[PDB]
Amino acid sequence: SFSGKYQLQSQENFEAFMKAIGLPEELIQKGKDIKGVSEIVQNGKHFKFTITAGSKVIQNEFTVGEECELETMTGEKVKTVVQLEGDNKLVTTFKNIKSVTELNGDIITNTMTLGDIVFKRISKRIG
Numbered sequence: 222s223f224s225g226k227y228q229l230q231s232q233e234n235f236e237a238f239m240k241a242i243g244l245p246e247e248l249i250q251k252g253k254d255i256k257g258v259s260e261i262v263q264n265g266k267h268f269k270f271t272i273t274a275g276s277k278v279i280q281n282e283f284t285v286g287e288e289c290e291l292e293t294m295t296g297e298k299v300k301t302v303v304q305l306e307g308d309n310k311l312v313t314t315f316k317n318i319k320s321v322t323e324l325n326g327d328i329i330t331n332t333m334t335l336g337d338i339v340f341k342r343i344s345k346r347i348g
C-alpha cells in the first residue's frame with residue numbers, strides 16, 4: 222500500500238535539520254543535493270524500508286503500534302512506536318522530532334519537525 226520504490230524530487234531545510242541533529246558536516250555537505258531512493262514493503266502492519274543516499278544505505282523495519290528500533294540519520298538507533306493515522310499516513314516521534322510520512326497517489330511527502338525547524342521531503346514513485 223505504501224509499498225513501492227520512490228525517489229526524492231525536492232526538500233527544504235536539509236542542512237539546518239541535519240546539523241541540529243548531529244550529522245557530520247562532512248556528510249551534510251555531500252548529501253544536500255542527493256536525490257535519495259526509498260524502497261518500502263508494507264505487509265499489513267509490517268513495514269520494511271531501505272533508504273539509499275549515495276553510499277549510505279539505511280535499512281529499517283517496524284510493526285505499526287508496536288515498539289520498534291529505528292536507525293537514525295546519524296546511525297543512532299532509537300526505540301519508538303510508529304502509528305497509522307489513516308491507511309496513508311505514518312506518524313512517529315523520536316528525539317523530540319515529529320516525523321509524518323504521507324502517501325498521496327505516487328507522491329510521498331515526509332515531514333520532520335525539530336522545534337521551529339521543518340524538514341520536508343517530497344518523493345515520487347519510480348521503478
Ligand SMILES: CCCCCCCCCCCCCCCC(=O)O
Nearest residue numbers: 259270292293294311320322331342
Ligand atoms: C532514517 C530516518 C528514519 C525515519 C523514521 C520514520 C519511520 C516511518 C518511515 C517509513 C518510510 C519513510 C518514507 C521514506 C520517504 C523519504 O525518504 O522521505
